Amino acid sequence: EVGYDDIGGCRKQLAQIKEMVELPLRHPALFKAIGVKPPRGILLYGPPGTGKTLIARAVANETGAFFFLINGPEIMSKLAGESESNLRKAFEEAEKNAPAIIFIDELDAIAPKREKTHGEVERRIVSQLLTLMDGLKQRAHVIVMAATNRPNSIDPALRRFGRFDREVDIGIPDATGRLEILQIHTKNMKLADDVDLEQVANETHGHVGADLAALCSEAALQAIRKKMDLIDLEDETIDAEVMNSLAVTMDDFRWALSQSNPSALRETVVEVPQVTWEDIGGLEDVKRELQELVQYPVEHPDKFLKFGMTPSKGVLFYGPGCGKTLLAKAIANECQANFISIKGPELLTMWFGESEANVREIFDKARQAAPCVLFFDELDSIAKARGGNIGDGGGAADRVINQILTEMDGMSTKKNVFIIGATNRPDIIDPAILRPGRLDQLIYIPLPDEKSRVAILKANLRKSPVAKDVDLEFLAKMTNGFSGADLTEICQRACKLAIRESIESEIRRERERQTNPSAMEVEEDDPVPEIRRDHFEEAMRFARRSVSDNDIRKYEMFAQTLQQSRGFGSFRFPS
Amino acid sequence: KSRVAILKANLRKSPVAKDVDLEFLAKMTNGFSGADLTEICQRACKLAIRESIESEIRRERERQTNPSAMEVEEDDPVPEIRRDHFEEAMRFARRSVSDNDIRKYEMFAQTLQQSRGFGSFRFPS
Amino acid sequence: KARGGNIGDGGGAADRVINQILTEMDGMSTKKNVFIIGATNRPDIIDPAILRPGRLDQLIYIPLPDEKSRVAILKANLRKSPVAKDVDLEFLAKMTNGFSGADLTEICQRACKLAIRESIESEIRRERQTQTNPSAMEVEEDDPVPEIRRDHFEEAMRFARRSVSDNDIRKYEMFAQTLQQSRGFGSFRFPS
Ligand SMILES: Cc1cc(OCc2nnc(SC3CCCC3)n2-c2cccnc2)ccc1-c1ccc(S(C)(=O)=O)cc1
Ligand SMILES: Cc1cc(OCc2nnc(SC3CCCC3)n2-c2cccnc2)ccc1-c1ccc(S(C)(=O)=O)cc1
Ligand SMILES: Nc1ncnc2c1ncn2[C@@H]1O[C@H](COP(=O)(O)OP(=O)(O)O)[C@@H](O)[C@H]1O
């Protein structure tokens, strides 16, 4: 049957559910001699196709509890006045086979009322379901798990104490989980040796477990269409050996990925960033300060408690393409905490639409995925949108920033969410953002140094084949004030020049065989196998400094606008 | 090349050691004007002069205490602008001309350009 | 432009529609097939966020058509219309020192309109002549103007006009050199 092996994604909420349900189910007799209330209901919510029903079935099988599935529309499709009988009989049957697990798939259909509550019979169904759910006499060990797309879609009374008192957001699987899902979905098709499922997994961003299964099936169907159809040898049952002779090639998977259309790309991603400190070449003072502020409270919470100091839970990066987003990702990676990034377009959308309640939802999501690093990238976007030199007649306060401040003030309770803010215009940022209890720790990210520039060039060119002849230290030193974005542009232009030269050359060489068919075929391989000095020289010919020295001067002004006075530098105690 | 020539012209009078690679200094100065290069050279000369005056003086001050005490050796503590003086000078290197006013000069040069479309002009054959 | 351009609104360049386009583009690239192309006659007022990496960063400048380009544009506009071989097209293209594609299209359309009016008026008169003086033997001489001639094009060019002034071309040249690749690396050589 289905078990933990079938449950893919390694998303680490299956472990939480296990810790939740073993003792109530794995050790049911224990609770008989101990006075404790187990989890009467667990609400699994997330994007559709994430395997919530699969997870519930696997838990039921691995714990031995009698699994009962109450399909939402199955009862809803039944005639009014007798569907209530179906729900009551389902609970009674689950009660009989104690311990039992009752799974309500698509719970947002039985009790969708969000206090709007249209209709008459559906109100009866929701109220009776409430009576049954609250009617659990704590006898036996029936655990009611329900599936829902979002927590707010179901009736709020279902979310109350004793009905569904604890919720788990399965969420979209990540690259590691996408790879494991691909492995589980590719185990009987005799996958080819060339295909590794790693490149596909990385390119598979935005898919869900159902999406991964559909992509694998589409690749298999492409393989079946490409071969074994030309022969057209078919019978009632295709020969096992004949079908096994085919191997799903990388090309088939690539085409399937091109024909994927993932079912929820837009959904926000809660993922541990893969970026590491290696990608950033320097910022040692900044790196150490970030390590302090974030890592120290958790690695050594006892020492923070000993001195009675509460660590700051907000940091605001200010600077000119210098790597603030990358720095935030790296700091999140070092602590192995989930990273949530709120770019400027999202804030601008909330501001234009006059919908700031999304800030509440974003903060709740960050709270659920703890430990997390809630990063508000380019937080000054709203101020720029309203102006910056003259702007609106009013002050710096705006709806979105006010909601963010309210959530931060109401935050800190969680002890895990850490707010990081990045802004290229510190002058226009609202001052309230920098007050204590908010993003008070201001960190300045300067233009990368020569060593930092070398590291940035190496990180950008790690994947590309770069000839050892081209000296990278010389190029980094040559770039007196290039930003990280400028270095990335130079590397991309060099790669583009190399690609164009290689394409043009092999194209001509192919004319050369077509025009003059050679008697003996002897390919000399690639005329340009790796990026050379001339490519980099031509690319650097177009190198440009995006960041002018005047805006760096303004940042230096603000930095010295956070000046530690000029009279205490020699402070000595009287002794 | 112009920067190298300017540096050579400024330092012709001053005694500069052959070890200092002036071409490297010229190429490292990305967009320094002639005034900036002259300022760097003057600062290097000033650093050399200050070091020579302080070292010769402090040596003489110690030596004068004992009459005829140390040998009569005629030492020149700094007889030429050294590399360290050039690093000392470059620490204070400054870009006088901002890229925005160079933008303005190129803008006026474009406005003075001979319009467009008459490049291909050719008399009929 | 709708919000202004010289003074505009009190706020910045950000607007609802461009913000949504940016959000879709940021959430795009997954498809690997859709390619976004943007055309703008006022690059100065375009939102800078549009040009950031991952967005429409590759800026391409389309200049006024050259003499050869003008000849090609005239040929394309006049491909369908019956044009007499007598009217030299290269001379007309070269004559138009700075005409835009729209200006050349207008010239061709005006020439066609003049030819159509002349043909209609002529055959109408010729029909009066038969009605007024019924000829004993019917012998139509066909069309008095079967194709566009030199005189039609000369009259049309008489009204030729340059829609695009040289000052707006100067502003475009400014922006183009506002994407200037520096002025110190042109001689970059690796140490060898
Ligand atoms: C002991 C303590 C821990 C704490 O929390 C620690 C923590 N855990 N997970 C996280 S989050 C995760 C880590 C990486 C990404 C984010 N954190 C945390 C807390 C603050 C800042 N960054 C992280 C708070 C406050 C206290 C205390 C201090 C003084 C006193 S008294 C009365 O003066 O003696 C009483 C209580
Ligand atoms: C190989 C590849 C193809 C691609 O897509 C190609 C494509 N197909 N249809 C289209 S669209 C259609 C064409 C005409 C109208 C539009 N495209 C496409 C892509 C980009 C721009 N224009 C077209 C993307 C990205 C990659 C890659 C590059 C580097 C690496 S690594 C880890 O550094 O080794 C991994 C993956
Ligand atoms: N991590 C996974 N491992 C194996 N199958 C998965 C996984 N995630 C999703 N699936 C596929 O998703 C299909 C249906 O999705 P489901 O489990 O019912 O979630 P939901 O009810 O939210 O749509 C299942 O048949 C299963 O094959």
mmCIF file with all atom_site columns, C-alpha atoms in Angstrom, chain A residues 203 205 257-262 265-266 343-346 348-349 352-353 378 381 384-392 424 469-472 474-475 478-480 482 485 489 496 533 536-537 540-545, chain C residues 3 9-20 22-33 47-49 51-53 55 57-58 175-192:
data_model
loop_
_atom_site.group_PDB
_atom_site.id
_atom_site.type_symbol
_atom_site.label_atom_id
_atom_site.label_alt_id
_atom_site.label_comp_id
_atom_site.label_asym_id
_atom_site.label_entity_id
_atom_site.label_seq_id
_atom_site.pdbx_PDB_ins_code
_atom_site.Cartn_x
_atom_site.Cartn_y
_atom_site.Cartn_z
_atom_site.occupancy
_atom_site.B_iso_or_equiv
_atom_site.pdbx_formal_charge
_atom_site.auth_seq_id
_atom_site.auth_comp_id
_atom_site.auth_asym_id
_atom_site.auth_atom_id
_atom_site.pdbx_PDB_model_num
ATOM 1   C CA . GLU A 1 203 ? 13.872 23.679 -14.296 1.00 0.00 ? 203 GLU A CA 1
ATOM 2   C CA . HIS A 1 205 ? 10.014 25.429 -10.577 1.00 0.00 ? 205 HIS A CA 1
ATOM 3   C CA . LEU A 1 257 ? 8.680  20.697 -19.500 1.00 0.00 ? 257 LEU A CA 1
ATOM 4   C CA . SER A 1 258 ? 8.061  23.079 -22.398 1.00 0.00 ? 258 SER A CA 1
ATOM 5   C CA . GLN A 1 259 ? 4.467  21.766 -22.411 1.00 0.00 ? 259 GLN A CA 1
ATOM 6   C CA . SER A 1 260 ? 3.903  21.866 -18.630 1.00 0.00 ? 260 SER A CA 1
ATOM 7   C CA . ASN A 1 261 ? 1.889  24.973 -17.685 1.00 0.00 ? 261 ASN A CA 1
ATOM 8   C CA . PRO A 1 262 ? 2.320  24.527 -13.913 1.00 0.00 ? 262 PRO A CA 1
ATOM 9   C CA . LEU A 1 265 ? 3.271  29.388 -10.579 1.00 0.00 ? 265 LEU A CA 1
ATOM 10  C CA . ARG A 1 266 ? 1.980  32.604 -8.975  1.00 0.00 ? 266 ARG A CA 1
ATOM 11  C CA . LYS A 1 343 ? 9.461  42.244 -4.105  1.00 0.00 ? 343 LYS A CA 1
ATOM 12  C CA . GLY A 1 344 ? 8.398  45.790 -4.916  1.00 0.00 ? 344 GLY A CA 1
ATOM 13  C CA . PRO A 1 345 ? 5.814  44.857 -7.548  1.00 0.00 ? 345 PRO A CA 1
ATOM 14  C CA . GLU A 1 346 ? 3.769  43.068 -4.867  1.00 0.00 ? 346 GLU A CA 1
ATOM 15  C CA . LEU A 1 348 ? 2.901  48.395 -5.488  1.00 0.00 ? 348 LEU A CA 1
ATOM 16  C CA . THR A 1 349 ? 0.017  46.081 -6.378  1.00 0.00 ? 349 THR A CA 1
ATOM 17  C CA . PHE A 1 352 ? -2.652 50.595 -6.142  1.00 0.00 ? 352 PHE A CA 1
ATOM 18  C CA . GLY A 1 353 ? -5.426 48.122 -5.358  1.00 0.00 ? 353 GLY A CA 1
ATOM 19  C CA . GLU A 1 378 ? 12.928 47.343 -2.483  1.00 0.00 ? 378 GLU A CA 1
ATOM 20  C CA . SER A 1 381 ? 8.897  51.487 -4.101  1.00 0.00 ? 381 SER A CA 1
ATOM 21  C CA . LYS A 1 384 ? 9.021  56.498 -5.268  1.00 0.00 ? 384 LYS A CA 1
ATOM 22  C CA . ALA A 1 385 ? 5.586  55.875 -6.784  1.00 0.00 ? 385 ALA A CA 1
ATOM 23  C CA . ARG A 1 386 ? 4.182  58.800 -4.804  1.00 0.00 ? 386 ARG A CA 1
ATOM 24  C CA . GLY A 1 387 ? 7.185  61.000 -5.639  1.00 0.00 ? 387 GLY A CA 1
ATOM 25  C CA . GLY A 1 388 ? 10.428 61.497 -3.738  1.00 0.00 ? 388 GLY A CA 1
ATOM 26  C CA . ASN A 1 389 ? 11.443 65.083 -4.493  1.00 0.00 ? 389 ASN A CA 1
ATOM 27  C CA . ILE A 1 390 ? 8.053  66.755 -3.987  1.00 0.00 ? 390 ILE A CA 1
ATOM 28  C CA . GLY A 1 391 ? 5.689  63.761 -3.870  1.00 0.00 ? 391 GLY A CA 1
ATOM 29  C CA . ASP A 1 392 ? 2.186  63.932 -2.477  1.00 0.00 ? 392 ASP A CA 1
ATOM 30  C CA . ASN A 1 424 ? 18.006 51.935 -2.733  1.00 0.00 ? 424 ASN A CA 1
ATOM 31  C CA . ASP A 1 469 ? 43.885 31.921 -20.143 1.00 0.00 ? 469 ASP A CA 1
ATOM 32  C CA . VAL A 1 470 ? 41.459 34.740 -19.286 1.00 0.00 ? 470 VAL A CA 1
ATOM 33  C CA . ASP A 1 471 ? 42.687 36.166 -15.972 1.00 0.00 ? 471 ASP A CA 1
ATOM 34  C CA . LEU A 1 472 ? 39.755 37.056 -13.714 1.00 0.00 ? 472 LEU A CA 1
ATOM 35  C CA . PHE A 1 474 ? 42.923 41.413 -13.676 1.00 0.00 ? 474 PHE A CA 1
ATOM 36  C CA . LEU A 1 475 ? 39.391 41.962 -14.979 1.00 0.00 ? 475 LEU A CA 1
ATOM 37  C CA . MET A 1 478 ? 40.318 46.760 -14.002 1.00 0.00 ? 478 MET A CA 1
ATOM 38  C CA . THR A 1 479 ? 36.649 47.443 -13.135 1.00 0.00 ? 479 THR A CA 1
ATOM 39  C CA . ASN A 1 480 ? 37.227 50.379 -10.785 1.00 0.00 ? 480 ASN A CA 1
ATOM 40  C CA . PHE A 1 482 ? 31.462 48.274 -11.409 1.00 0.00 ? 482 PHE A CA 1
ATOM 41  C CA . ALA A 1 485 ? 24.844 44.005 -11.852 1.00 0.00 ? 485 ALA A CA 1
ATOM 42  C CA . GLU A 1 489 ? 26.093 42.177 -17.557 1.00 0.00 ? 489 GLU A CA 1
ATOM 43  C CA . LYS A 1 496 ? 26.456 35.929 -25.725 1.00 0.00 ? 496 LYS A CA 1
ATOM 44  C CA . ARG A 1 533 ? 40.283 36.189 -23.848 1.00 0.00 ? 533 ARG A CA 1
ATOM 45  C CA . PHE A 1 536 ? 35.942 38.908 -22.719 1.00 0.00 ? 536 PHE A CA 1
ATOM 46  C CA . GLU A 1 537 ? 37.831 41.813 -24.297 1.00 0.00 ? 537 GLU A CA 1
ATOM 47  C CA . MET A 1 540 ? 34.419 44.555 -21.676 1.00 0.00 ? 540 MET A CA 1
ATOM 48  C CA . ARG A 1 541 ? 34.557 46.976 -24.608 1.00 0.00 ? 541 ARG A CA 1
ATOM 49  C CA . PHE A 1 542 ? 30.852 47.506 -23.825 1.00 0.00 ? 542 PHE A CA 1
ATOM 50  C CA . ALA A 1 543 ? 31.324 47.450 -20.046 1.00 0.00 ? 543 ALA A CA 1
ATOM 51  C CA . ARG A 1 544 ? 29.482 50.274 -18.309 1.00 0.00 ? 544 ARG A CA 1
ATOM 52  C CA . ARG A 1 545 ? 29.127 51.700 -14.781 1.00 0.00 ? 545 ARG A CA 1
ATOM 53  C CA . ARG C 2 3   ? -0.530 61.253 -16.922 1.00 0.00 ? 3   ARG C CA 1
ATOM 54  C CA . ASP C 2 9   ? 1.228  63.633 -11.728 1.00 0.00 ? 9   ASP C CA 1
ATOM 55  C CA . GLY C 2 10  ? 2.787  64.293 -8.346  1.00 0.00 ? 10  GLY C CA 1
ATOM 56  C CA . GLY C 2 11  ? 3.827  60.654 -8.078  1.00 0.00 ? 11  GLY C CA 1
ATOM 57  C CA . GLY C 2 12  ? 6.585  58.848 -9.915  1.00 0.00 ? 12  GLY C CA 1
ATOM 58  C CA . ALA C 2 13  ? 6.572  56.892 -13.152 1.00 0.00 ? 13  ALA C CA 1
ATOM 59  C CA . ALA C 2 14  ? 4.928  53.843 -11.559 1.00 0.00 ? 14  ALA C CA 1
ATOM 60  C CA . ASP C 2 15  ? 1.348  53.165 -12.666 1.00 0.00 ? 15  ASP C CA 1
ATOM 61  C CA . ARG C 2 16  ? -1.133 50.330 -12.206 1.00 0.00 ? 16  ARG C CA 1
ATOM 62  C CA . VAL C 2 17  ? -0.900 48.852 -15.712 1.00 0.00 ? 17  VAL C CA 1
ATOM 63  C CA . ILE C 2 18  ? 2.900  48.941 -15.922 1.00 0.00 ? 18  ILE C CA 1
ATOM 64  C CA . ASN C 2 19  ? 3.137  47.472 -12.426 1.00 0.00 ? 19  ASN C CA 1
ATOM 65  C CA . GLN C 2 20  ? 0.877  44.585 -13.444 1.00 0.00 ? 20  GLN C CA 1
ATOM 66  C CA . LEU C 2 22  ? 6.105  43.960 -14.499 1.00 0.00 ? 22  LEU C CA 1
ATOM 67  C CA . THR C 2 23  ? 4.515  41.457 -12.116 1.00 0.00 ? 23  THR C CA 1
ATOM 68  C CA . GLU C 2 24  ? 3.489  39.222 -15.011 1.00 0.00 ? 24  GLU C CA 1
ATOM 69  C CA . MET C 2 25  ? 6.944  39.459 -16.593 1.00 0.00 ? 25  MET C CA 1
ATOM 70  C CA . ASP C 2 26  ? 8.617  38.648 -13.268 1.00 0.00 ? 26  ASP C CA 1
ATOM 71  C CA . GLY C 2 27  ? 6.290  35.671 -12.956 1.00 0.00 ? 27  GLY C CA 1
ATOM 72  C CA . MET C 2 28  ? 6.948  34.843 -16.599 1.00 0.00 ? 28  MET C CA 1
ATOM 73  C CA . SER C 2 29  ? 10.068 33.279 -18.169 1.00 0.00 ? 29  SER C CA 1
ATOM 74  C CA . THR C 2 30  ? 8.744  29.976 -16.833 1.00 0.00 ? 30  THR C CA 1
ATOM 75  C CA . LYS C 2 31  ? 7.038  29.307 -20.171 1.00 0.00 ? 31  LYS C CA 1
ATOM 76  C CA . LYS C 2 32  ? 10.331 29.642 -22.082 1.00 0.00 ? 32  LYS C CA 1
ATOM 77  C CA . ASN C 2 33  ? 8.352  30.629 -25.194 1.00 0.00 ? 33  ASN C CA 1
ATOM 78  C CA . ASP C 2 47  ? 9.288  53.735 -16.328 1.00 0.00 ? 47  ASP C CA 1
ATOM 79  C CA . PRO C 2 48  ? 12.896 52.766 -15.469 1.00 0.00 ? 48  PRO C CA 1
ATOM 80  C CA . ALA C 2 49  ? 11.723 49.528 -13.833 1.00 0.00 ? 49  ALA C CA 1
ATOM 81  C CA . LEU C 2 51  ? 14.455 48.300 -18.285 1.00 0.00 ? 51  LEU C CA 1
ATOM 82  C CA . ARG C 2 52  ? 15.798 46.361 -15.287 1.00 0.00 ? 52  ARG C CA 1
ATOM 83  C CA . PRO C 2 53  ? 17.285 42.900 -15.903 1.00 0.00 ? 53  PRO C CA 1
ATOM 84  C CA . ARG C 2 55  ? 12.477 42.877 -18.115 1.00 0.00 ? 55  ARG C CA 1
ATOM 85  C CA . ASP C 2 57  ? 16.434 45.379 -20.935 1.00 0.00 ? 57  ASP C CA 1
ATOM 86  C CA . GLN C 2 58  ? 17.655 44.997 -24.532 1.00 0.00 ? 58  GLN C CA 1
ATOM 87  C CA . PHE C 2 175 ? 18.935 58.961 -25.075 1.00 0.00 ? 175 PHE C CA 1
ATOM 88  C CA . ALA C 2 176 ? 20.929 56.657 -27.349 1.00 0.00 ? 176 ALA C CA 1
ATOM 89  C CA . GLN C 2 177 ? 24.140 58.265 -26.165 1.00 0.00 ? 177 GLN C CA 1
ATOM 90  C CA . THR C 2 178 ? 22.565 58.158 -22.706 1.00 0.00 ? 178 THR C CA 1
ATOM 91  C CA . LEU C 2 179 ? 23.187 54.431 -22.952 1.00 0.00 ? 179 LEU C CA 1
ATOM 92  C CA . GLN C 2 180 ? 26.879 55.184 -23.519 1.00 0.00 ? 180 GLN C CA 1
ATOM 93  C CA . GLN C 2 181 ? 29.367 52.349 -22.990 1.00 0.00 ? 181 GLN C CA 1
ATOM 94  C CA . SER C 2 182 ? 31.739 54.505 -20.921 1.00 0.00 ? 182 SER C CA 1
ATOM 95  C CA . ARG C 2 183 ? 34.802 56.248 -22.369 1.00 0.00 ? 183 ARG C CA 1
ATOM 96  C CA . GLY C 2 184 ? 37.835 54.521 -20.811 1.00 0.00 ? 184 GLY C CA 1
ATOM 97  C CA . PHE C 2 185 ? 37.635 50.811 -21.625 1.00 0.00 ? 185 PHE C CA 1
ATOM 98  C CA . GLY C 2 186 ? 37.567 51.009 -25.434 1.00 0.00 ? 186 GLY C CA 1
ATOM 99  C CA . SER C 2 187 ? 41.209 49.852 -25.420 1.00 0.00 ? 187 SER C CA 1
ATOM 100 C CA . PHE C 2 188 ? 40.889 47.136 -22.755 1.00 0.00 ? 188 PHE C CA 1
ATOM 101 C CA . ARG C 2 189 ? 43.624 44.522 -23.219 1.00 0.00 ? 189 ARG C CA 1
ATOM 102 C CA . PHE C 2 190 ? 44.398 41.543 -21.005 1.00 0.00 ? 190 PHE C CA 1
ATOM 103 C CA . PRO C 2 191 ? 47.930 41.418 -19.519 1.00 0.00 ? 191 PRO C CA 1
ATOM 104 C CA . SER C 2 192 ? 50.122 39.141 -21.631 1.00 0.00 ? 192 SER C CA 1
#
